[PDB]
Amino acid sequence: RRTDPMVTLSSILESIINDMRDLPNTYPFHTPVNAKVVKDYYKIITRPMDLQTLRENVRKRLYPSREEFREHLELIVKNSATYNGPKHSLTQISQSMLDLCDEKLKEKEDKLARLEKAINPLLDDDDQVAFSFILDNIVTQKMMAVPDSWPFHHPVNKKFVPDYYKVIVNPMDLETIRKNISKHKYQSRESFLDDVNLILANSVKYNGPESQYTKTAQEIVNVCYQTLTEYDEHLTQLEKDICTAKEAALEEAEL
């Protein structure tokens, strides 16, 4: 049953690296230029690339799609253009590798498009963006409007509260939550609420259960819950559409 789409994609990329390595005359691009032999090379080339580095990157799961892989590959040709010359023999050799890569990626175009959706199912998904937008409005319109909430709007300032980060191991604030929303970190309200509740847990632990600041944090948490309830039906639909889209993508990658 379930194979990880990033493993499947990386294996195709790795196979392409090996086909490029096999090509005649490509050896100077297999490994990084040796600084001790080409003494000025890294003064000219500031983003170096070679087949070994590319393969380590594939291994490290750095590429979620064709596009980021190809970009790095192309840097091998651009760097040769710059260093050896746009029309130099070595530059035509590097281009021979880019050309083989494109041919192999065209060959596997349908499987790759499916792996790529499975790896990043919610890129430009209107349901995720709509869901994020509603959460961001709960934060800015409701949670940040709680009287005296400002000290929870941004991370605690160490300058005025110097033991904070010694006491609190997992700090959280509304600005950090908004940054998470902006990056579409939350797919359902459960993970958003983990962060919102962490704000109150930190204040119960640092300021104490009866502190005025804990009472404020408690009101921020209450308004968050009340507004989510208000919007429950609309949010359930979005959550359903998001969780379903992820699953459908992972299955079409298998099938």
Residue numbers in the entry: 1398 to 1652
What does the original paper state about this entry?
Multiple protein interaction modules can be tightly linked to form a single stable interaction domain, or they can be connected by flexible linker sequences allowing conformational adaptation to diverse sequences motifs. In contrast, the two BRDs in TAF1 are free to orient independently as shown by the different domain orientations in the dual-domain structure determined here and a previously published model (Jacobson et al., 2000). The frequent combination of multiple interaction modules in the same protein suggests that the epigenetic reading process involves concomitant recognition of several PTMs. Insertions x6 are present in the C-terminal BRDs of TAF1 and TAF1L and possibly PRKCBP1.
The 61 BRDs in the human genome cluster into eight families based on structure/sequence similarity. Despite large sequence variations, all BRD modules share a conserved fold that comprises a left-handed bundle of four α helices (αZ, αA, αB, αC), linked by loop regions of variable length (ZA and BC loops), which line the Kac binding site and determine binding specificity. The four helices form a deep cavity that is extended by the two loop regions (ZA and BC loops), creating a largely hydrophobic Kac binding pocket.
